[PDB]
């Protein structure tokens, strides 16, 4: 909660749930 | 087909296991359209 | 401690020339700059993972 | 409209798919621009309306494949595209 065309942003392989 | 597209992009006839990027999604244009407002206020040629 | 940043990818021809076919035809003869940039960005992405 | 149709609006030339727009120009406004400082909305000179101009080449593509030494079957992943728009 404390942290906020031709070009694409790829999602990470490991979601935040797996890191948790 | 996408396998042939991958071969074409990688410039090789054999592709190893993995994931590759080739191109994007594209619709070729058909016609050219030109638009301008109404042609009013014609010059007075008839009186000449 | 930071670990990984945002993984980004670029479509070289689409960014450079947009929707102009003649622009792409003129572009294809500058070589393999687009291939180099795609390769570098893919390397960065897999390194982040 | 709704196709890759080149357009030359009042001397402004571009290429893209024309779509109906929900943006509300001010009475004198003619051209619309996006965050990219590139033309994204236009006003038809003959009829006072607003048209969005999305791109013709939109939709990332990638080819998942095992080694061709093994098999020739492939799968296609379209990036950032809902499954009902292909
Ligand atoms: C241009 O003419 C058409 C019909 O010929 C009309 O519907 C339209 O309102 C006119 N444009 C303007 C700005 O008056």
Q: How would you characterize the largest beta sheet of chain A?
A: none
Q: Can you tell me the overall shape of chain A?
A: flat
Instruction: Estimate percent helicity of chain A.
Output: 10-25%
Order of helices and strands of chain A: EH
Q: Which ligands accompany this protein?
A: 2-acetamido-2-deoxy-beta-D-glucopyranose
Query: What Rg of chain A, in angstroms, do the CA atoms define?
Result: 12 Å
What is the terminal separation of chain A in angstroms? 15 Å
Category from helices, strands and their pairing of chain A? alpha+beta
Query: What share of the residues of chain A does DSSP label as strand, in percent?
Result: 15-25%
General description of the model:
- The structure is cut from a larger assembly and holds 4 copies of chain A.
- With 20 residues, the first copy, chain A, is of the alpha+beta class.
- Helix content of chain A is 20%, strand content 20%.
- Chain A is built from 1 helix and 1 strand.
- The B-D interface holds B 1-3, 5-6, 14-38 and D 3-10, 15, 17, 44-46, 56-70, 72, 74, 76-78, 81.
- Strand 1 of chain A pairs antiparallel with strand 1 (7-10) of chain C.
- The complex binds 2-acetamido-2-deoxy-beta-D-glucopyranose.
- Chain D: Glycans are attached at residues 69, 82.
Features of this protein?
binds 2-acetamido-2-deoxy-beta-D-glucopyranose; flat; 20 residues; 4 chains; Spike protein S2' (chain A); part of a larger assembly
